Amino acid sequence: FEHATTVPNVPGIPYKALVERAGYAPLNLEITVVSSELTPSTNKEYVTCKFHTVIPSPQVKCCGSLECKASSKADYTCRVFGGVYPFMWGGAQCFCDSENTQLSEAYVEFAPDCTIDHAVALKVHTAALKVGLRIVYGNTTAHLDTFVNGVTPGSSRDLKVIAGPISAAFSPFDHKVVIRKGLVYNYDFPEYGAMKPGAFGDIQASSLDATDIVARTDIRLLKPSVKNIHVPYTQAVSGYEMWKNNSGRPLQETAPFGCKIEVEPLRASNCAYGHIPISIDIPDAAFVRSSESPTILEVSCTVADCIYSADFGGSLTLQYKADREGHCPVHSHSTTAVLKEATTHVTATGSITLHFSTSSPQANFIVSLCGKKTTCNAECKPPADHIIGEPHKVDQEFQAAVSKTSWNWLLALFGGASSLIAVGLIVLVCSSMLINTRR
Amino acid sequence: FEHATTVPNVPGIPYKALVERAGYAPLNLEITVVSSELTPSTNKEYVTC
Amino acid sequence: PTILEVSCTVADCIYSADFGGSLTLQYKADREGHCPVHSHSTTAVLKEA
């Protein structure tokens, strides 16, 4: 039976449903998103990190001239200085006062420590929500993973499931994202090759192992104005370190919907966003023929002490009579209430003390027991503790958020205001017809 | 879970209340003041005889 | 345990400082066990709990 329903995309929440085929008995269905692994499609724009300004050993032509040459190295820059007459500890390193030039040279390369303390820039073209689902149907159950797309079904042995499209398309990753030592930051990094000095990504390459690194750290070669040989290099503060100091907190602690964030591959885990359209290809052998299931003769309900809370703050006792003992499914036909239990034993007579959690202050919901339906209602009170360590298993249907004791006043006062809107016209009709009867 | 109630300030009398822990089955609660010790703040003024 | 049905029939009783009152309750329950018993009304307190 290819049943279908919408499941709330909240991790660990046991959503419950009931399937009512014609000839087969009612069967309990419950779903929980045990995991979500929203992984975006991504590619490496560039790696970036601290750079080891290498200022290579300078070159000299003691009596002649020199000229720089082009090079592929990152931010490679050169100047030829005249009249340098440089010295080393041995003494003067050249034999001409004039006619002597210094070829200073500078370039940048990834520091040896970039093997680990480095960042990688990634784009997130799109993200597909792959949710691991725990599914239980009748007494049997299976654990499987599915993609919330509505195109590719997730099948676990005989049980096949199709999920999606997600109710609300969502992703925590901004179009640009940067990864650093397992942390994730949504910094709007500049495009490949678009390096700017001192900002993030001032040096970039496709890989730390690459030999085509490029950079633009505004490195400047000053005029050697000292007796000993020197290459006075002045450059912008290392952009990677500057960003590291001002990155703000990582998305890993600020992503919406409480999503945990993990690398390898980049993904958002346990996001609690929207709802997941679910359809299940339940194998027929899971059901039993209606007459095979115990069936009630008479049922009644009593609910007491209930409290609207994320906890199962409600308690109710259902009284029943049934054709025979056995196991029965139980469910709530009102989504404003959900039961803790799901299946119970039953007897020719007796009662089941069920547990439930509800948001509406009135426990006004139709409980279904073994295919029968019985109304239950009672005043539920606000919890004594304003905070609970558990997510709510229900959402406030505004139609029931107003208590009967409060909805009472709405449905009372909205009526009376209209009470005379027609009476004036009725009096007009009466007087006019009296005139037409006497005129 | 916490509960609160007023209690008659009478020694030896076992006061009794019922805690209605929502979905948990209620629990009896007898509050019994074994003794009271109203201690005034005091300072010695002087000894005399 | 929890009780499906219950009713109160008070025996002869005396309003006094002591437990001069006695009452009885018929009950129907789902199973055996120690249920709590208490008086929600402030003007009366049960000896048993």
Automatic annotation (TrEMBL), chain B:
Superkingdom of origin organism: Viruses
Cell location: Host cell membrane; Host cytoplasm; Host nucleus; Virion membrane
Assembly behavior: The precursor of protein E3/E2 and E1 form a heterodimer shortly after synthesis.
The protein's name: Structural polyprotein
Organism per entry: Western equine encephalitis virus (WEEV)
Complete-protein stretch covered: 798 to 846 of 1236
